[PDB]
Structure 1
Amino acid sequence: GLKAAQKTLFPLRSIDDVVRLFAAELGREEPDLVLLSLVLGFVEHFLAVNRVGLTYFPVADLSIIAALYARFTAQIRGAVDLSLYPREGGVSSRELVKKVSDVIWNSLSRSYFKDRAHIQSLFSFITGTKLDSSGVAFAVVGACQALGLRDVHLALSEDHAWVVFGPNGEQTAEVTWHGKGNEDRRGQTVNAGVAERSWLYLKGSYMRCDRKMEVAFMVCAINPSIDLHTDSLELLQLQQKLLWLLYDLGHLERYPMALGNLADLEELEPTPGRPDPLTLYHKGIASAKTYYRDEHIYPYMYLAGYHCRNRNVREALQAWADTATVIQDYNYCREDEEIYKEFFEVANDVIPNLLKEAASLLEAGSQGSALQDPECFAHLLRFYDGICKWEEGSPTPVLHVGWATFLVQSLGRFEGQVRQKVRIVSPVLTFQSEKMKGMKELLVATKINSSAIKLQLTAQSQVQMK
């Protein structure tokens, strides 16, 4: 190592002192990822993992943080001999990146629950020898920075992390595992995944972080959970203040998920004088459209979730339709299961429950109901259209009869006089999927033909013999 200037703010005695540290680091040529991660993990440990003795804020003394830092840098410098990996052109080699990844990996406890909370930071790595998947990638990036490898950066998709490095930052390397029971590809590029148009690699529209975005990632990674029922107010406040710092400095401009997480935080506890959650969700979407070819799914899911929680049925349906309009241009591949789960839950749990409540409120005389609005019926149909188009050309199917039952139920929540108002052109809607085009017929009958809908959604050839 730490430079004299990095040590002057210690000891950190409050949330605001932590913020000052982040501000100072973000004003340097290269914010110190190892320092920042250790500090966050320290404070998260004593605010969420073990609050015994807590009276206000766990004071971070320089002696403690410097000793942690020293343990990290000694482990990396000792295990990674740079002389073995000459740096042609001031850039790193694939062998070097693999070596660092191996060092982190080989350091981890043989057996532990990999999706436990509070195993994301370098504090967990040093004190517990435990990291979660994306924590391994971050730690490889922190280790490379500590070694002076200015070219190695964190790459992020909506469900995975890896690194970029090399000439022009153009190389990619896997450095961690993905999911559960997948075969790891550490050391390889991500080009096969990009080529197959999976959600996992976002068709190449994944995030290539700079150092400041790496800081935003560790701040997003703060986990305020104490247990299932309780969050640390202190950590929520810290994460929120740090996200605003990053926002003000321009460092969330290319980070849609961070803007969504900040909006979620503001919904819980708004900061006076700041943009509304809805504004922030829309900025997240704008970020995805501007920097990532509008190929991200979660910016629309964050917005829909807000509208959902506020029982704005119309706007939630619109946002979910827009989510499906993104997914339609992907191929559903092995390893995309997390997004399938999200779409399944929306279709088969969240929407049904929203519409059930809407039906009850309609019975009690509501006005302007989504169930009387043909634009809302159109959004529902557009959501299913994108899911069907997603399925087209995919190596694994998406729909099955489990989805058909909920589709029939959801359609039926709208009276025929409402459904009849949507014009399906080859409120107006154009279908992209062949499944929904063949369904058009069935979508306006007063009584929905349940069996025909099921046949059309699942492309089941036949009915019961006997």
Structure 2
Amino acid sequence: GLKAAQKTLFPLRSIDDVVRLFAAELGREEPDLVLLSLVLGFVEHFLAVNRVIPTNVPELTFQPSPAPDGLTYFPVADLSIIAALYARFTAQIRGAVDLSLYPREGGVSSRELVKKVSDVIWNSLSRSYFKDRAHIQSLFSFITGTKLDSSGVAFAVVGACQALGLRDVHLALSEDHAWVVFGPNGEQTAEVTWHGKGNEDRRGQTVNAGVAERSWLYLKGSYMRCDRKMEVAFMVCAINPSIDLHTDSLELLQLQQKLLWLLYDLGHLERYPMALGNLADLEELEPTPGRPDPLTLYHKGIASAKTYYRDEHIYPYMYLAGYHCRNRNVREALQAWADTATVIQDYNYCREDEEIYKEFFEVANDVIPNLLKEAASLLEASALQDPECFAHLLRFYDGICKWEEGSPTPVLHVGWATFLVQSLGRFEGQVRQKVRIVSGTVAGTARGPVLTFQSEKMKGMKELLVATKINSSAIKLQLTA
């Protein structure tokens, strides 16, 4: 329930008031996920979902404040409103799950109980709604509009488990999926939501099969296993400032930025590489004085991935590659994309890994080709004369070819092939020839750029890629084989 220490910080008439609430709750032994998710959901609703202030609705009020170029109206999170919704949730879950009927062997939650709570959330949801709809992540959505996005279901199951007093059930995240972790050592996995559009219902099942499959979706087992603090972080990263496709709520941007700096300072993003990248993106738009540069943050994310996740994550490098791409840094962007490909090389492409495929596809056949086309125009009155770029480009295609190896479905098709030739061509033979494609001569040590191919496809083409004249026939045929 809501304790006196929580209720005294209400009402929340500003961003700074909401941050105070989070700061307090993060200090608590067990931060209340339900309360924090409801508050965020409440403010997001009026700052992005429906910005029109209600004319008839009493008891609901707005707080005027000076804006940095007139006035801004913030939704006042009243204790009456937030507690009413909090009460509705706890009522709904407690009045559906009979704890007496389940034996809590030394506090450890049984698989049967986990599945029950998972079913309560699942069966409460609307029969038909657009699953990729924005602002349907928070518990405010589950209560007010009974709609939740894919990862939102998993967050709710964890929030609901917490309400029931089950302090061992936690959120488990990958880079494109969410599930639950529980057990006496927290080694029992349970699917509690769906993935993609029409890929069957694996709910209630274990994650073991996807981990063994070497699929990017279950990150070969080196996925995030949240604590209550990392769950709060997820919640903050889940803030959606999008009003529409081209505009954003400044208050929700300013709110997500402040909450992430708070989380950072208590060291709660040290195991969340994608959060460091999100904070970096926000620091790029409106940098807060005193705080580190976006590049410091982009690399803190990469550092986190290498330290706590065996350097098996893709987005930390994508976040950096995007920043350099935005800043037209070409070599640095192509370096970062080549690093991304080195990670995906020891993964196998499975049907459910479609999101990361679409990402590599856009960079290989749209983003990189545009950067090189732009680079070519700027030459006529530099990165196309740098041999390191051409090495990075080839290392990028090396990782993708290596990824395809051992995969049940092919990655590279004739569509990838055309853009390889085009991109190779953007570099003059003289520049291409400077890159030495060496397999190595002596293993270890005793007491122009150099590149080694890991993939068979790229190895078989080493001589073709470096030739003065490009044989489109052979290069296309070898990449697609």
Distance 2:322 2:281 in 1: 9
Q: Deviations over 1:245-296 (max 9, x none)?
A: 0000100000001011110111111111111110100000000000000000
Residue 98 (structure 1) shift: 0.5
Distance in 1 of aligned mates of 2:163 and 2:74 = 29
Residue 29 of structure 1 deviates from its aligned partner by: 0.2
Offset from partner CA, 1:299-321 (integer Å, 9 cap, x none)? 00000000000000000000000
Q: Give CA-to-partner distance per residue, 1:141-196, whole Å, 9 cap, x none.
A: 00000111000000000000001001111100000001111111111110000001
How far has the Cα of 1:235 moved from its partner?
A: 0.2
Instruction: Measure, in 2, the Cα distance between the counterparts of 1:302 and 1:400.
Output: 26
Q: Give the Å deviation of 1:54.
A: 9.4
Residue 419 of structure 1 corresponds to 432
Q: Aligned partners of 1:55, 1:79: CA distance in 2, in Å?
A: 42
**TM-score normalized by the length of structure 2:** 0.94
2:152 corresponds to 1:135 = yes
Alpha-carbon distance in 2 for matches of 1:92, 1:343: 40
Higher mean alpha-carbon deviation, 234-243 vs 443-452, is at: 443-452
User: How far did residue 34 of structure 1 move?
Assistant: 0.2
Partner of 2:281: 264
Q: In structure 2, how many angstroms separate the alpha carbons of the residues matched to 1:130 and 1:376?
A: 46
Mapped to 1, the partners of 2:476 and 2:380 lie a distance apart of: 28
Task: Find the aligned partners of 2:119 and 2:98 in 1 and give their Cα distance.
Answer: 13
What is residue 30 of structure 2 aligned with on the other side?
30
What is the Cα deviation at residue 404 of structure 1? 0.3
CA RMSD, 1 decimal: 1.0
Residue 376 of structure 1 deviates from its aligned partner by 0.6
Report whether the alignment pairs 1:371 with 2:384.
yes
- Residue aligned with 2:189, SS: strand
- Deviation for aligned residue 1:41: 0.1
**What's the CA shift for 1:138?**
0.1
Question: Structure 2 CA distance, aligned partners of 1:13 and 1:329?
Answer: 50
Task: Give the corresponding residue for 1:444.
Answer: 466
CA distance in structure 2 between the aligned counterparts of 1:195 and 1:83, rounded to whole angstroms: 37
In the alignment of these two chains, the number of paired residues is 454
CA–CA distance in 2 between the matches of 1:209 and 1:393?
Answer: 31
Partner SS for 1:56: strand
Q: Deviations over 1:215-270 (max 9, x none)?
A: 00000000000001110000000000000000001000000010111101111111
Deviation of the 1:130 alpha carbon: 0.1
Shift in Å, 1:55: 4.5
Cα deviation, 1:348-374, whole Å, max 9, x if unaligned, reads 00000000000011122xxxx211111
Alpha-carbon deviation of 1:4?
1.1
Cα deviation code 1:43-79 (max 9, x no counterpart): 000100111x995210000000000000000000001
Instruction: Indicate how the Cα distance of structure 1 residues 240 and 220 shifts in structure 2: closer, same or farther if over 3 A, else same.
Output: same
- Give the C-alpha shift of residue 447 in structure 1: 2.2
TM-score (norm 1): 0.97
Mapped partners of 1:338, 1:69: distance in 2: 35
- Structure 2: distance between partners of 1:20 and 1:55: 20
**TM-superposed deviation, 1:334:** 1.8
What is the SS of the residue equivalent to 2:9? coil
Percent identity for Structure 1 against Structure 2: 100
Gaps of 5+ in 1: 460-466
Partner SS state of residue 271, structure 1: coil
* Aligned mates of 2:262, 2:454 — CA distance in 1: 42
Other structure's SS at 1:68 match: helix
> 1:386-397 residue pairs with structure 2 within 5 A?
386-397=399-410
| d(CA) in 1 for partners of 2:268, 2:92 | 31
Distance 1:89 1:178 in 2: 33
Q: Decide which moves more: 399-408 or 445-454.
A: 445-454
Partners of 2:40 and 2:375 lie apart in 1 by 43
Paired with 2:416 and 2:101, the residues of 1 have a C-alpha distance of 56
- Counterpart Cα distance in 2 of 1:308 and 1:296: 20
Q: Shift of residue 451 of structure 1? A: 1.1
1:334 and 1:416 map into 2 onto residues whose CA distance is 38
Question: SS of the residue aligned with 2:142?
Answer: helix
Q: What per-residue deviation string (whole Å, max 9, x for no partner) do you get for residues 69-109 of structure 1?
A: 00000000001111121111211011111111100010000
Aligned mates of 1:413, 1:370 — CA distance in 2: 10
Aligned match of 2:420: 407
Q: Distance in 1 between matches of 2:469 and 2:87?
A: 71
